[PDB]
Amino acid sequence: APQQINDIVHRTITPLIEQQKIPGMAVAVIYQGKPYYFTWGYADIAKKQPVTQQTLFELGSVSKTFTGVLGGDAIARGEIKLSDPTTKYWPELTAKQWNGITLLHLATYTAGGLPLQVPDEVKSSSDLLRFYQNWQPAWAPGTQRLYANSSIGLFGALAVKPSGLSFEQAMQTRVFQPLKLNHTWINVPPAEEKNYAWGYREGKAVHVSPGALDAEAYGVKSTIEDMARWVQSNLKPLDINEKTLQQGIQLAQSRYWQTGDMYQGLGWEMLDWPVNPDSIINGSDAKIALAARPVKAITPPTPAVRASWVHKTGATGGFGSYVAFIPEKELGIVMLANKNYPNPARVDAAWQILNALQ
Ligand SMILES: *[B]([O])([O])[C]([N]C(=O)[C]C1=[C][C]=[C]S1)C1=[C][C]=[C][C]=[C]1
Ligand SMILES: [K+]
């Protein structure tokens, strides 16, 4: 690999791993479009299995970028419109607070304060309808952003209804297969278990547990090679041959709302580049505090801006992931770890590496 990439990655990541006591980590840097891979430590401490380029990590909320793109692909196919009220796809949601809440609001966390998590007690289709019917918004739609699994998760489930496919089947056939993400899974098959890393929380080996809207909000597992390909695909959508998927990727990076320095896409979040890490932390869900932020509508949405820091953080109980890329520099990074460590440390490391290579 080019020595400049080797050096900045190792000099940045080694201290990160030591400081955060991460058991295993994989990193990919996409430079001028080509991927370069790095791995450290262990996928399974007890069984002494090393992290490799084939190790599967839980992406946590980075899964929302796949949900946003799959929804963009459905818009491009003419199956749904973001301006469509939620009730068009779920007539059974008769409670009055749903009047005026559109798919756009679900996809961008602006429905009026849907909760951060779907409760563990929600286990059936009937339980989920009850949950949404009983939810009382704190705000009118389209006024404040409150990051939430229950918002984009519902968007994902509804976006695939016209297709006649399950969410998993739609993701596989419309996003994973065309992009050749052949080791990316919503459900890890038994054949792939040998590469599935364990996550570590308080020193115990753990995997994410089943939950309502898990696939849609935080349930993808992938390797560092497939994630590098996902970044490549989002950096250069015009190279994608499937027309609706190319258009869907473009729609997911459009700018729909602004709050401070951040712009909300579908799954992806963006800031104008150049920008420093402190502003990225304060202008993203990477900050430690859970925040209600008033938003300004971008009417109409701005098409994907090349000079942007486009990114997404993700976590499960035992994993911490981060993806960031800058289209105009053809530069990106993926960091996958089997410990959920502080988001600010992820941003600091990613920025140190990309700033050195831009
Ligand atoms: B995402 O922002 O990473 C999201 N992830 C999950 O809900 C998956 C988890 C299962 C157990 C712990 S995290 C997230 C939303 C809200 C709080 C933390 C992470
Ligand atoms: K589920």
Active-site residue (options: 61, 63, 150, 163):
61
Give kind and range of the element (H or E) at residue 11: helix 3-20
List strand residue ranges (DSSP E) for the chain, in order: 24-31, 34-44, 49-50, 57-58, 144-145, 184-185, 199-201, 204-206, 221-222, 255-259, 262-264, 269-272, 293-294, 296-302, 308-315, 320-326, 331-337
Which residues have C-beta within 8 Å of that of residue 8, sequence separation ≥ 6? Answer: 352, 353, 356, 357
Cis amide bond preceding 327, omega within 30? no
Round to whole Å and give the CA distance between 93 and 6: 53
Which residues have C-beta within 8 Å of that of residue 159, sequence separation ≥ 6? Answer: 67, 70, 71, 74, 79, 80, 89, 103
CATH class of 1-358: alpha beta
C-alpha distances in angstroms, 64 versus 60, 122, 218?
Answer: 8, 20, 7
Burial (Cβ within 10 Å: 0-12, 13-18, ≥19) of residue 219: buried
Q: Is 109 annotated as a binding residue?
A: no
Give the 3-state secondary structure of 229-281: HHHHHHHCHHHCCCHHHHHHHHHHCCEEEEECCEEECCCCEEEECCCCHHHHH
Q: Is 147 annotated as a binding residue?
A: yes
User: Can you tell me which residue has the tokens 């289209």?
Assistant: 327
3-state helix, strand, coil in the chain (%, to 5): 40, 25, 40
Contact, 28 vs 225, CB < 8 A? yes
Torsion of CA 174, 175, 176, 178, to 10 degrees: 70
Burial 292-327 (b: 16+ CB within 10 A, else e): eeebeeeeebeebbeebbbbbbbbbbbbbbbbbbbb
User: What number of helices (H) and strands (E) belong to the chain?
Assistant: 11, 17
Instruction: State whether the beta carbon of 206 lies less than 6 angstroms from ligand 1.
Output: no
Which residues have C-beta within 8 Å of that of residue 215, sequence separation ≥ 6? Answer: 63, 156, 167, 168, 171, 186
Q: In the chain, where are the structural domains located?
A: 1-358
Contact, 57 vs 335, CB < 8 A? no
Instruction: State whether the beta carbon of 65 lies less than 6 angstroms from ligand 1.
Output: no
Amino acid at 233: S
Instruction: State whether the beta carbon of 149 lies less than 6 angstroms from ligand 1.
Output: yes
C-alpha distances in angstroms, 32 versus 11, 13, 111, 354?
Answer: 21, 21, 38, 12
Respond yes or no: is residue 61 known to be catalytic: yes
Q: Which ligand is nearest to the CA of 208?
A: 1
